[PDB]
Amino acid sequence: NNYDGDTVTFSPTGRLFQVEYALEAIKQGSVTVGLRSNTHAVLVALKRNADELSSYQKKIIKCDEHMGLSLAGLAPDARVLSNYLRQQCNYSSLVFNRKLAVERAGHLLCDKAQKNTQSYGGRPYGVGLLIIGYDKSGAHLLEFQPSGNVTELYGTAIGARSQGAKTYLERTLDTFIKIDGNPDELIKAGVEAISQSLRDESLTVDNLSIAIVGKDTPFTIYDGEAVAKYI
Amino acid sequence: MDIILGIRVQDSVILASSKAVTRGISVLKDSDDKTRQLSPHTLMSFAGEAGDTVQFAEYIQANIQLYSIREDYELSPQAVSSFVRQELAKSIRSRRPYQVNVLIGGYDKKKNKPELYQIDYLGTKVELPYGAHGYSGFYTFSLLDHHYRPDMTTEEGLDLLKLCVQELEKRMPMDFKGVIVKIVDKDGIRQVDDF
Amino acid sequence: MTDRYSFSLTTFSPSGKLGQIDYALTAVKQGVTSLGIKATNGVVIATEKKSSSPLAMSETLSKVSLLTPDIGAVYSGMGPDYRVLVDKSRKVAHTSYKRIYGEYPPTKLLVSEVAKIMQEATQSGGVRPFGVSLLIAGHDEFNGFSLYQVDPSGSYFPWKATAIGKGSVAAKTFLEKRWNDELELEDAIHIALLTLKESVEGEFNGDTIELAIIGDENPDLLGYTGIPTDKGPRFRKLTSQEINDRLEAL
């Protein structure tokens, strides 16, 4: 109200409204799902078009051979944060000959977002990210909020109508965690999860975007006729 | 480059500058004009290290042309020479100094007088009836000391200049491929196309 | 962090007033009275030592300050602002003059430097004006004795005699009746003590009054002998006893 003019101002109840408004931009964004087993980790994303002449906005970005994310919210902010992750993954490989741990990647994203919430002149990031990866401790899934809060999960969803997919994953928890050594079935579970968030529209060939990373699987993105198999 | 001469007579200033450009072993050009018009009644000839000479001359030219447009007025030869001196005095304590020596021949329209200024790369300025840079003075000054009069005509100045060039062509080891001669007077700047 | 106040805090209002300068002058008006009188053979500057508490040692608080051996200063208004201005004035006398010319600045030019500092606090980014008016007395070879007033705006004026602060209006009228161009230094001190008594409520003695002069050279205060041209400072702060002696002939 009187306390939402900038990110440097607490409200009388201790809230940061500019951060909360940035969180609101994610809720307007298109739905994207993340889930993992013990061998693989999967991203599923519903892409959004402007109209029938337009292309469908890309949602998934590769960060390294073993790591990548999906976005929901301001796309240019995702480009900035993913670029930073690309650099940090790269610094780890060049300097230490070491693949960057997914947990450490989450810590770095948290700290980068935090600085934009405590200083004058700047603004919070207006995007949410779902980071998947396979490192020395197996498969991982992270959820990033521009408040700075990063959380490790078995599965999750962000964007508009993401609550439906999140409840489905909460039911299916015991089933999909056991899908080891079967990439197709894990993606099926993710496609079925994101279907719980659809209304009026359905998953078409240029609508759907899928990414996977695992034990002997580099981070790869599937679009176009490559996802027709799962429709 | 090599030889640049200057002489101030009754009503004009005459500048003579060699045409040769030599890059070590070969003479690459024999028609090089080692001068820049700074303003309608002011001419500057130059000699020194390759590249720096033309770079400095054109830089000065640009600055005087800028002043002329800003004020709608031509600076006096004295004022132009002082500006050039300061630039060279500034340059000598720089990271990489301009290795450039100049003569400035101008006709002052206010005083109705020709003026010749000699400035070396250190920023050493002197006003002279006649001047030179490098070894040119060593061969020519004894002739100029003898024949020079302050009331000489332009034609007499050219004749005395011819005698100087002839002595240079006789006793200098280097072939400087003749000189381009230019006259600065009340009507402006013109080139003597047969010398 | 970083100072993000790069804009002026003093600005013109629709009526053409510079509010912050006017308000700084109001702070000066609330300040304790100080005065200055110029004689033929000297200058005197004086003020009241308004002690905040009787447990406080008011001798440790100097309202009258030496700027150079021949220049002194007194103020009315905010004490802390004065103290830092004295520090800056002492330094600028060296950096912008003595380290260049090998001699102390003339009164008018040191005043000019202090004035410049006060002007800049009226235009520079993220600062308020100084809440003081200064009276600067001094001597130099070619200008003789002089007395100047400097205001929060940076404006300065030379005076034969003047007063600033609390009871300045009444004090200036008192000085107009007594001042002439034939006054000796002792006469000016006498008039200074008379003028200052009117604005003082409580105790009036050497311990509650601070008074200094710009007068003859004091070779006894030089600290060394041997150089004929060096004859000592013209600034001298009067002692508590010296003030009380002149209060009996009052």
């Binding site: - | 640009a62 600055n63 800028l66 | -």
Partner: protein, 240 residues
């Protein structure tokens, strides 16, 4: 440093500081440009509220940027000097590096770029100035006339006016200027320019300035008497 964003968008998609800069131009004295077949004429209004003026030394309204290009303006006089200085420096810089004087379009594009920059840089306000830039490209006999404004947009004009009451003189030019047959001579072009200012000026005395630019760096400013002869001939034809 002072970084405050003074030029910003409003809810309706307007940048008010740029729009208010145009209001400063509206207040400025009228300036007009007309191009003939082999010339361009720049006319300028002088407000007669200021007499006891020394006209020898007072800043003239038309400024040479180079020997072949001129610049006139409407708006804040102090602001215009900054643009004129920058334009003159760029003109010499162009000659120094390209070894050819600026084209009229290039010089216009530079000045317009400076104006635009001051509409999205921190801590600065836009120029309260619109300019008319006229001249001839090197070794070219085709007349050139361009206009710039505070936003930084620029364009070419057969004839144009800026400043106070420019709506009126543009009205005149739109019905009197024929594109198929522009003022064939210097006389005809100056006459049409003086006529256009007489719609707005008041007295045809020391209130009208005229500068003629011809090809090959031929620029001359007309005197009071020369302009007065145009003023005389125009009204004697009007008495009919």
């Amino acid at each position: 440093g002072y970084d405050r964003a003074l030029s910003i968008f409003s809810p309706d998609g307007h940048i008010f500081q740029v729009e208010y800069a145009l209001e400063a131009v509206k207040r400025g004295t009228c300036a007009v440009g007309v191009k003939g077949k082999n010339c361009v004429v720049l006319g300028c209004e002088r407000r007669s509220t200021l007499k006891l003026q020394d006209t020898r030394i007072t800043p003239s309204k038309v400024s040479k940027i180079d020997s072949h290009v001129v610049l006139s303006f409407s708006g804040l006089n102090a602001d215009s000097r900054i643009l004129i200085e920058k334009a003159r420096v760029e003109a010499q810089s162009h000659r120094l590096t390209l070894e050819d004087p600026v084209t009229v379009e290039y010089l216009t594009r530079y000045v317009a770029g400076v104006q635009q920059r001051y509409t999205q840089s921190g801590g600065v306000r836009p120029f309260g100035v619109s300019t008319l830039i006229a001249g001839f490209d090197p070794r070219d006999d085709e007349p050139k006339l361009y206009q710039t404004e505070p936003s930084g947009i620029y364009s070419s004009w057969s004839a144009q006016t800026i400043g106070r009451n420019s709506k009126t003189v543009r009205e005149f030019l739109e019905k009197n200027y024929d594109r198929k047959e522009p003022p064939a001579t210097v006389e005809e072009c100056v006459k049409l320019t003086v006529r256009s200012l007489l719609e707005v000026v008041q007295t045809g005395a020391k209130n009208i300035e005229i500068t003629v630019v011809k090809p090959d760096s031929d620029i001359v400013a007309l005197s009071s008497e020369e302009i007065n002869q145009y003023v005389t001939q125009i009204e004697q034809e009007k008495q009919e």
